[PDB]
Design a protein around this ligand. Structure first.
Ligand SMILES: CCc1ccnc2c(N3CCCC3=O)cc(C(=O)N[C@@H](Cc3ccccc3)[C@H](O)CNCc3cccc(C(F)(F)F)c3)cc12
Length: 372
């Protein structure tokens, strides 16, 4: 009953239905593995269809503490409290959880996104104001018998968040696991990057400067500047039969082709090799251009298909965002401190190439690829 419990608009996040308070107030909540605060709009905003009304909830408790969270994109300010929370299309339980009631925000809520709050699924270590503010999933596990893991299948868009386990109908082939290096973000280690089979040939620590995370709340694959520049050079080289403005590669403008004629074949596959559970072993996930060229829906341009380049630069480490997660089934196995990847039932592919998760691979270089 949890399959297809996610919805969204492309590039604007995936959300699950939840209720907060007594009686239950229904809200759509963006699922974010890249943060650890549960926060909901709690005052009127031009882009909010609805919001949390604390005065109508008899179970609301004010914690008398303010909270501020600045993300890569957007920020909000709010008041901490606790209240009863449920997930109608998830486990049939009711949890008392911390909630940040958002009373002011800047460039956080998105016009027409259909969500009114955010569910930070990462660890307390990065919760604001500090790590004593227990994240939602921790509360869920402590207060119920739900097993300590969840899985995401990100595919108008839809998908599934399976709470408490793994749904085999959602993937094919094998699940490959990479260690969670540190429990704050879902931090992993990338050991090798290839563009159309060709190694970027960097010290592998560069791929994880200063950390690498799996983040459903971020759209792009974001790469450390040095890695980003190398990647773009290689993708340009592979696609050189056509020349695009420098602004496209910086994500500052779209590229468009007559509807139905996108030249997928001139763009390379990107392979990210993730550290395995065994010494010097790894597996790779392969990303097709249908993933990193993100379609931008606009009726005005609809004689064409237009795309934004969804790989961009980062000064805070690698972020494997939604365009990376889409088409894979990703298991956040908190209990065993590992992340699993498998090919999704809604995988990307044309008649020539297919997204893949495969291994094992062996590296001869014994360097630790972790930055710290
Ligand atoms: C879905 C909305 C969206 C669309 C398009 N682009 C987006 C984008 N960007 C910017 C450039 C490339 C890119 O993909 C970045 C983010 C973004 O910052 N995601 C947030 C969640 C969020 C969700 C909805 C609205 C705002 C934030 C996530 O927590 C970040 N994790 C690390 C993180 C960073 C900093 C602090 C924290 C902490 F404080 F929460 F821990 C976590 C959302 C984008």
């Amino acid at each position: 009953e949890m399959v297809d419990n996610l919805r969204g608009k492309s590039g604007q996040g995936y959300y699950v239905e939840m209720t907060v308070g007594s009686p239950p107030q229904t809200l759509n909540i963006l699922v974010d593995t890249g943060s650890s605060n549960f926060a909901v709009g709690a005052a009127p905003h031009p882009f909010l269809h609805r919001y949390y009304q604390r005065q109508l909830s008899s179970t609301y408790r004010d914690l008398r503490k303010g909270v501020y969270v600045p993300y890569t994109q957007g920020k909000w300010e709010g008041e901490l409290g606790t209240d009863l929370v449920s997930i109608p299309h998830g486990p049939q339980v009711t949890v008392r959880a911390n909630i940040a009631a958002i009373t002011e925000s800047d460039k956080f809520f998105i016009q027409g996104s259909n969500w009114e709050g955010i569910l930070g699924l990462a660890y307390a270590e990065i919760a604001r104001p500090d790590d004593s503010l227990e994240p939602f999933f921790d509360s869920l596990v402590k207060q119920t018998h739900v097993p300590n893991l969840f899985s995401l299948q990100l595919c108008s868009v839809g998908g599934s968040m399976i709470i408490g386990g793994i749904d085999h109908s959602l993937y094919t082939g094998s699940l490959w696991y990479t260690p969670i290096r540190r429990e704050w973000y879902y931090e992993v280690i990338i050991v090798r990057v290839e563009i159309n089979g060709q190694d970027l040939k960097m010290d592998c620590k560069e791929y994880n400067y200063d950390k690498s995370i799996v983040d459903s709340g971020t759209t792009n694959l974001r790469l450390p500047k040095k890695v980003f520049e190398a990647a773009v050079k290689s993708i340009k080289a592979a696609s050189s039969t056509e020349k695009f403005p420098d602004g496209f590669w910086l994500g500052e403008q779209l590229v468009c082709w007559q509807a139905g004629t996108t030249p997928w074949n001139i763009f390379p596959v990107i392979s990210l090799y993730l550290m395995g559970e065994v010494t010097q072993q790894s597996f790779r996930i392969t990303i097709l251009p249908q993933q990193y060229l993100r379609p931008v829906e606009d009726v005005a341009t609809s004689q064409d298909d237009c795309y934004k380049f969804a790989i961009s630069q980062s000064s805070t480490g690698t972020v494997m965002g939604a365009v990376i997660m889409e088409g894979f089934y990703v298991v956040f196995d908190r209990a065993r401190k590992r992340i699993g990847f498998a090919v999704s039932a809604c995988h990307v592919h044309d008649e020539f190439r297919t997204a893949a998760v495969e291994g094992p691979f062996v590296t001869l270089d014994m360097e630790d690829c972790g930055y710290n």
